[PDB]
Write a protein that binds this ligand. Sequence first.
Ligand SMILES: Nc1ncnc2c1ncn2[C@@H]1O[C@H](COP(=O)(O)OP(=O)(O)O)[C@@H](O)[C@H]1O
Ligand SMILES: Nc1ncnc2c1ncn2[C@@H]1O[C@H](COP(=O)(O)OP(=O)(O)O)[C@@H](O)[C@H]1O
Ligand SMILES: Nc1ncnc2c1ncn2[C@@H]1O[C@H](COP(=O)(O)OP(=O)(O)O)[C@@H](O)[C@H]1O
Ligand SMILES: [Cl-]
Ligand SMILES: [Mg+2]
Ligand SMILES: [Mg+2]
Ligand SMILES: [Mg+2]
Lengths: 116, 112, 113
Amino acid sequence: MKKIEAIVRAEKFPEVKAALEERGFYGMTVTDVKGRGQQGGMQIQFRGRTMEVTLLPKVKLEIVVKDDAVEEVIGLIVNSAFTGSPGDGKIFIIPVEDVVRIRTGERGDDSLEHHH
Amino acid sequence: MKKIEAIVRAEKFPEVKAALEERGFYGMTVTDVKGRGQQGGMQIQFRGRTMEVTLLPKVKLEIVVKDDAVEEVIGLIVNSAFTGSPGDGKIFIIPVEDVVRIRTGERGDDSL
Amino acid sequence: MKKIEAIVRAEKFPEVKAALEERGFYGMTVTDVKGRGQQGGMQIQFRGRTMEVTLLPKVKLEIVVKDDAVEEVIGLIVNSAFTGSPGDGKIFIIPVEDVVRIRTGERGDDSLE
Ligand SMILES: Nc1ncnc2c1ncn2[C@@H]1O[C@H](COP(=O)(O)OP(=O)(O)O)[C@@H](O)[C@H]1O
Ligand SMILES: Nc1ncnc2c1ncn2[C@@H]1O[C@H](COP(=O)(O)OP(=O)(O)O)[C@@H](O)[C@H]1O
Ligand SMILES: Nc1ncnc2c1ncn2[C@@H]1O[C@H](COP(=O)(O)OP(=O)(O)O)[C@@H](O)[C@H]1O
Ligand SMILES: [Cl-]
Ligand SMILES: [Mg+2]
Ligand SMILES: [Mg+2]
Ligand SMILES: [Mg+2]
């Protein structure tokens, strides 16, 4: 199993959620966050004075899936979140050693849906 | 050491927090999040008016502990967060390679 | 590559952000969170009854960096977030198997920062 953690533009998140649901990926956890990237370098210019580069709102999506679904989900998120401009976001792939379903106590192979 | 990341109902979170504190598990970080699960499928019903399945509020708990404590913490969370209905949540066990205490610069299970 | 997840005081966060930027570490994701530590033990009081220990606001910083940069970034955070009182926070180092840049599809140390 892996955790896929994606940071995307708020404007694009509804198309990422729809793209995932259309292929049966329903379980997801979402957080409002702020971020910056390289754009702006060390500082910015506010008519006279020096200003820091602003942390701006973004949406964090976390989706935990079986190893055999990781590449499919990365593609769905990349093709729905893309616009072409700096600030489109990044995806991190993090190992998960086990998952427990609270309602049933199922774990391991029984804790996540099989797509294949 | 391991990071235990649990997504629970906001109504159950106080009972999970007390069950952990009773057994000396005091350090924890908590975030307000939203989520959906399998319940609802693709869309739901509001009158020949499809609507999307809503992302609803949940509480995310993160607690980092020694390897030997992981199963005890998982059972304390499951027993206090359970209701039996869809939406009860999930627990993810994630490896941590080290931990640093900012106040002293101490590392290892020591720093926990 | 590794994910460095640091929980720090809100008052110290602007000094942490400036210390990383000064050394060219620009990419970072920040979340408002709440937390408690050991301080307070099982409970407190009172006027004049017992109460739970309060989960209080903190700032979570996540920065993903190359393996060879981890010890430098740990030093930058410890020195800028330190005050010397209980509640200064903790840094967790979590393995990352890969990173994907959405704009280009590029992966690896390459996709950083
Ligand atoms: N190295 C990093 N670690 C953590 N979060 C990051 C990192 N890089 C980018 N992010 C997140 O992704 C968002 C978009 O960054 P990005 O698309 O890389 O912008 P830029 O093109 O300006 O570098 C950021 O605002 C931040 O939330
Ligand atoms: N695979 C997943 N990845 C990330 N978060 C998830 C996953 N599955 C469930 N969750 C989180 O757990 C919450 C409860 O889901 P769950 O109990 O699985 O509901 P259901 O019974 O409807 O499938 C969700 O709203 C979401 O926040
Ligand atoms: N084991 C842990 N797991 C998760 N988060 C923690 C842990 N320990 C501390 N934290 C986070 O770090 C913050 C600061 O804790 P810390 O400095 O250790 O306090 P104390 O000195 O009272 O033990 C907490 O409020 C919490 O957000
Ligand atoms: Cl993580
Ligand atoms: Mg970037
Ligand atoms: Mg589910
Ligand atoms: Mg502590």
